[PDB]
C-alpha cells in the first residue's frame, strides 16, 4: 500500500498570504492525486483532481502541481473562506489512501 504524508500538519497564516502544502507518496502514483478541503462540521469538498485540474467553482487562487511521489497544493493569497483542513488522496490502483491532513488556521 502506498501511503501519503502531508506536510506541514498545521500552518498558521494570515489572510492575503500565499501558502504551499505538500503531499508525498511512498510509491509512484502517476499523477492520480486529488485534493479536498474540509471545514468544521462539513464533509470534505473536492478542489483538484489529476494533480492540476480544478473542480468546477473552485477559485483559481488554488493550483496543484507534481509528479511521481511529490505533489503540491498552492494557495495564492488566502481568503477567510480558505481556513480548514486539506487532504490529498491517490487513485493509483487500490486500496486508495488519504494523507494525514494539513490544518490551515488563521494567525
Amino acid at each position: 500500500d502506498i501511503v501519503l504524508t502531508q506536510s506541514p500538519a498545521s500552518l498558521s497564516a494570515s489572510v492575503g498570504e500565499t501558502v504551499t502544502i505538500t503531499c508525498r507518496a511512498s510509491g509512484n502514483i502517476h499523477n492520480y492525486l486529488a485534493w479536498y478541503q474540509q471545514k468544521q462540521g462539513k464533509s470534505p469538498q473536492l478542489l483538484v483532481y489529476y494533480t492540476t485540474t480544478l473542480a468546477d467553482g473552485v477559485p483559481s487562487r488554488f493550483s496543484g502541481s507534481g509528479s511521481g511521489t511529490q505533489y503540491s497544493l498552492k494557495i495564492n493569497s488566502l481568503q477567510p473562506d480558505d481556513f480548514g483542513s486539506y487532504y490529498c488522496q491517490h487513485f493509483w490502483s487500490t486500496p486508495r489512501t488519504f494523507g494525514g491532513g494539513t490544518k490551515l488556521e488563521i494567525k
Binding site: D1, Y32, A34, Y36, K42, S43, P44, Q45, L46, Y49, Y50, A55, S85, Y87, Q89, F91, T94, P95, R96, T97, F98, G99, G100, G101
Partner: protein, 116 residues
C-alpha cells in the same frame, strides 16, 4: 442535484455489528462507484472501501476482514456493515460518489460511537 444521505445506529456497544445506509438520489448506482470513508474525532480521513457500478468491491487492506459493502440498485441504497466493533471504530462515516478519479459528491456523514 446529486444527494447522498447516510443513516446509522448512533451509539452501539463494542462487539456488536454495525450497518450504515447510504441513500442516493439523482444518479444511478449502475454508472458510478460509491466509496466509504471514515473520520475518527479530531483525526484524518480513512478509506474503507468502495463498490463499483458493476458491483465489484475493493476494501482497505487492514479492515477487509471486518467489512462488507453491498448495494441495492433498485432502492438506490449502498450499505456498509462492520463486525466486532471496537471502541476505536468510533468515527463519522461518509459515502461519496466516484467518477473519473475523484469523489465529487459526499453525504454529510453519520457519527457512530462505540460505547458499552
Amino acid at each position: 442535484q446529486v444527494q447522498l444521505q447516510e443513516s446509522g445506529p448512533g451509539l452501539v456497544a463494542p462487539s456488536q455489528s454495525l450497518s450504515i445506509t447510504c441513500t442516493v438520489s439523482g444518479f444511478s448506482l449502475t454508472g458510478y462507484g460509491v466509496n466509504w470513508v471514515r473520520q475518527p474525532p479530531g483525526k484524518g480521513l480513512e478509506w474503507l472501501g468502495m463498490i463499483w457500478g458493476d458491483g465489484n468491491t475493493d476494501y482497505n487492506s487492514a479492515l477487509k476482514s471486518r467489512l462488507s459493502i453491498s448495494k441495492d440498485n433498485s432502492k438506490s441504497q449502498v450499505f456498509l456493515k462492520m463486525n466486532s466493533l471496537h471502541t476505536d471504530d468510533t468515527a463519522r462515516y461518509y459515502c461519496a460518489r466516484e467518477r473519473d478519479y475523484r469523489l465529487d459528491y459526499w453525504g454529510q456523514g453519520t457519527t457512530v460511537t462505540v460505547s458499552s
